[PDB]
């Protein structure tokens with residue numbers, strides 16, 4: 076049952092090195108995660124033994140590669156509990172998945188008077204495609220407001236969503252506040268108003284179980300690179316009845332059935348939405364990442380991260396002059412600022428002690444404006460991090476504070 | 484100077500195995516190429532040592548990954564002799580690159596009366612995005628006709644292209660006929676009529692030197708998986724003055740400069756066209772494939788493939804009852820049919836002898852209709868193939884012919 080962190084860290088070769096003469100402390104898994112040998116050796120065995128293009132009815136290596144690629148599609152369907160492989164589309168990442176929904180669903184289903192509803196805590200990937208789609212259609216964009224601790228109340232959702240709302244798009248978990256939003260209840264409110272709900276699951280999928288039947292979301296998007304898998308690949312899930320009626324976002328080989336000089340017809344789902352040679356190795360590697368995380372247990376990973384987040388919030392409250400943003404109940408990250416030290420300089424001095432964090436707006440400029448700052452620092456955690464690494468981070472922040480005070 | 488094929492094959496681990504009790508003979512590099520250890524160990528060193536998300540001004544591993552990703556962009560610029568890294572955009576593959584030109588350039592620059600000119604030998608990736616763009620704009624699609632040996636004459640180009648033509652899109656090399664089209668002279672004809680030229684370089688880039696300044700093409704697209712590099716990545720080259728005036732195809736983080744609630748502004752080139760976390764490992768691996776092919780020499784690879792194609796065409800002319808399609812002067816592939824044996828069954832029986840070829844329409848249904856067949860078989864070559872492998876293929880075709888005659 077209970078995960079052993081020593082034995083998990085032993086499977087990630089990149090953790091065992093020094094930076095600037097200190098052991099690496101990597102606390103930037105919300106920007107990207109590190110990979111275990113089970114995934115890296117999956118990519119190696121594919122390119123060393125059975126790489127070939129994918130299709131029905133070809134030679135021996137081509138059949139092995141096709142069985143690998145469509146095998147990985149079934150592992151994804153089981154991992155988020157979708158009803159069918161026709162609802163699982165491989166893309167290059169969360170951002171491309173949400174752009175496909177805005178191009179193929181929203182640009183076809185919006186007209187003047189219609190509304191798209193989003194929230195002030197959304198990442199840019201779940202803001203800009205909607206700004207562009209309402210511009211193209213003459214519709215209206217509206218924002219749900221936040222409570223003072225950076226949570227959403229269902230009363231404010233009901234107030235913002237109306238019978239003119241056609242789409243509500245919302246993060247499952249914020250990559251800055253750590254808030255877990257009440258998606259299942261928000262889906263009920265959208266459906267009761269006649270709208271669909273589009274969920275950005277880039278920060279939830281790596282760190283907690285997803286069940287799209289229980290959430291009842293109409294679309295759900297995620298990225299491999301945040302959940303121990305290769306870069307350059309992601310998924311778009313959509314309910315089959317909505318994908319059946321959407322046109323493709325891109326056109327070419329593999330997604331057609333018949334091509335004449337002027338007109339063509341498309342393949343059935345899910346291939347209708349996969350044009351060209353697919354991301355073969357990366358999707359097979361994402362299937363190996365899923366197998367790896369399922370063998371550990373997503374509920375075990377969630378419980379470890381609950382322990383690390385509770386420990387970090389307590390230890391941050393021990394520091395004078397430090398502000399943390401967002402709620403007490405949260406996922407495994409802390410975004411903060413020191414009084415009087417710019418967050419870029421915090422991240423500079425921490426990297427000189429071996430500690431990797433990120434500073435900036437975290438692709439959420441409207442949220443930074445809501446918080447009344449121009450930038451923040453963020454430490455974010457995953458299954459290979461430990462309480463001793465959080466002690467290193469809070470000791471380094473104390474020394475940073477004393478350093479800049481001495482400078483001034 | 485002169486390539487040693489023994490020493491090149493020793494670097495591709497996948498070539499050294501048996502299929503169905505016979506040494507593998509892989510003759511399907513136009514569908515995808517195999518990779519050398521220099522590229523596979525590039526991906527391993529990235530995930531074992533320096534994976535992190537990319538950006539200016541971050542921690543030590545993030546700086547190494549950013550220097551790797553933008554380093555690979557400069558290797559691509561030098562490899563096709565573009566003037567600037569602002570003209571080199573990383574995408575998921577040729578098909579996505581041509582869809583970006585059709586969405587962001589053609590849908591903005593076509594109106595009724597305007598024409599897009601293509602050719603009957605084009606792959607579907609360079610047909611369907613134009614069918615869709617002329618549909619959206621009310622413009623007209625026109626085809627340049629072919630000569631009887633599957634070449635294009637510059638007189639027919641001048642006849643088809645007019646002062647109402649705005650875009651000419653054409654393959655550099657056909658993945659079925661093996662024809663090398665006269666792109667530099669076609670670009671002159673397009674420009675003299677007021678049009679831009681879009682070149683599909685998926686089959687030329689792996690196998691011959693590309694110089695986009697000498698070709699004077701306005702856009703050029705290519706795929707990593709055909710040129711010894713990872714799956715899931717490709718390039719779109721465009722002249723800087725045309726990209727500056729095109730809007731992005733996808734929207735999100737990394738491609739913005741300022742994001743307000745309703746309106747945003749974009750980053751400079753090339754990042755304006757790269758939304759979200761990039762294909763970090765795959766682009767670094769494509770840079771290693773470029774370094775590998777440059778150390779061998781693309782002119783040396785082209786000369787090897789000229790020798791293999793001349794040898795194969797002679798040996799095919801020794802077989803009774805076999806038709807080869809396309810011209811005598813050609814790239815390194817042969818597409819053919821046996822009289823009275825369906826090409827699917829040819830590829831079935833060849834794979835039982837260890838030999839991998841492909842049968843079907845090769846994503847070029849209008850060309851198969853021009854050729855008056857419904858499908859063909861294709862053997863295609865690259866730097867690791869040899870004359871002995873072509874002998875195996877022609878001996879297996881003789882035995883296939885005798886087999887089916889005996890059956891009947």
Ligand SMILES: CC1=C/C(=N\Cc2c(COP(=O)(O)O)cnc(C)c2O)C(=O)O1
Pocket residue numbers: 105106107168169170171198200201246248249250275276277278298300437438536537736758759760
């Ligand atoms: C460098 C960086 C990207 C980050 N976010 C990825 C992301 C994305 C974009 O995913 P991507 O297309 O894989 O970059 C969308 N929504 C949420 C909630 C995200 O966390 C981040 O937090 O730090």
Ligand SMILES: CC1=C/C(=N\Cc2c(COP(=O)(O)O)cnc(C)c2O)C(=O)O1
Pocket residue numbers: 128129328350351352513514515576577578579606608609654656657658683684685686706708845846
């Ligand atoms: C399975 C298969 C794909 C093939 N073609 C890739 C290709 C493509 C599409 O490139 P992709 O997006 O990498 O699949 C466009 N133009 C030409 C001339 C091509 O050769 C092929 O010949 O066999």
